[PDB]
Write a protein that binds this ligand. Structure first.
Ligand code: HEM
Length: 309
């Protein structure tokens, strides 16, 4: 069949919790490291972990290594079922809340600068909480290395190597399937971030890693073609210029702008090829740009939705 003739929403259901590589993780502590910001940090107690980022990666990796029970708080992005009853430490979306963090008495914060403010991260460290700044590569090729880096922080190198190899095998296997399913002329795609019916409506660019996702799905990322490094408002002119065949979105994001019907009311959407086919691939918010352990499964399920009727 011809995937350019497909119409309407395709939605991938939540992939769920990461399958841990072990049932008896025993962190080898203490660890000393120099983090991505150049801070020397000693990690001596991982009993109460806050694994915080924009993308939902770290919480999933920590669970994959065998430490899900050690997670005591989360951001809005870590939507995995195991953490559904865990205290949320961000507000207004992605803003760190120092009070919420400190009241959980964490023993380890794993974080990066995808969320802020930086001042809150500094406050937590000054209060005595071991805080480790990561700077993950966030590419499909580097899924294993990003996992090994997290594993080192919590003193689980063997679990890290197992989880890395398992995840990389899964994502290469999925790629084999994607390559068989892709059309000769790749679909043009963009990653459209929406939250609400107002101005939070953006084409995501290089910094957010969606090119890696779109190319992993066999598509061409029009944001990369147009040189969008951070993000761009998805206004009528930008949409007309990018003219994707498919909008890749987050499922709850799409709901928040009124579903397909609400999306079609936004200026410029209906005029694109994707708009004229109402063609949206909706991915679970907390996995969509998390990469990490579940990347292979995400690519497999999403490619089935894109290319199989
Ligand atoms: C790129 C990775 C991102 C992920 C995985 C992500 C994920 C999420 C999730 C899961 C929520 C909670 C929605 C809900 O509870 O239904 C949320 C909320 C929110 N996000 Fe993001 N987000 C991302 C990036 C962004 C960006 C780039 C912006 C702005 C430029 C943004 C602005 C917001 C705002 C304002 C909210 C508040 C929604 C509310 O009040 O319910 N997010 N995000």
């Amino acid at each position: 069949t011809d995937p350019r003739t497909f119409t309407g929403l395709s939605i991938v259901e939540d992939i769920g919790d990461v399958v841990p590589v072990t049932d008896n993780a025993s962190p080898a502590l203490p660890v000393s490291l120099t983090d991505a910001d150049g801070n020397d940090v000693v990690v001596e107690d991982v009993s109460r972990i806050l694994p915080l980022d924009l993308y939902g990666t770290y919480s999933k990796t920590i669970a994959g290594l065998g430490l899900v029970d050690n997670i005591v708080g989360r951001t809005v992005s870590s939507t995995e079922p195991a953490l559904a009853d865990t205290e949320v430490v961000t507000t207004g979306g992605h803003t760190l809340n120092a009070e919420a963090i400190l009241n959980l008495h964490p023993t380890l914060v794993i974080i990066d600068h995808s969320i802020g403010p930086r001042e809150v991260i500094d406050q937590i460290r000054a209060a005595g909480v071991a805080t480790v700044i990561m700077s993950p590569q966030r590419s499909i090729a580097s899924i294993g290395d990003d996992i090994r880096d997290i594993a080192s922080v919590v003193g689980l190198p063997e679990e890290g190597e197992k989880l890395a190899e398992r995840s990389v095998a899964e994502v290469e296997e999925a790629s084999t399937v994607v390559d068989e399913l892709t059309p000769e002329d790749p679909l043009k795609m963009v990653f459209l971030y929406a939250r609400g019916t107002g101005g939070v409506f953006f084409i995501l660019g290089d910094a957010y890693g969606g090119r890696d996702l779109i190319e992993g799905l066999g598509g061409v990322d029009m944001a990369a073609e147009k040189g969008i490094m951070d993000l761009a408002p998805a206004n009528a002119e930008a949409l007309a210029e990018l003219n994707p065949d498919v909008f890749v979105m987050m499922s709850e994001g799409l709901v928040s702008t009124g579903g397909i019907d609400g999306l079609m009311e936004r200026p410029g959407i209906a005029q694109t090829t994707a708009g004229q086919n109402q063609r949206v691939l909706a991915l679970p918010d907390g996995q969509s740009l998390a990469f990490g352990a579940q990347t292979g499964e995400l690519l497999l399920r999403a490619s089935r939705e894109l290319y199989v009727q």
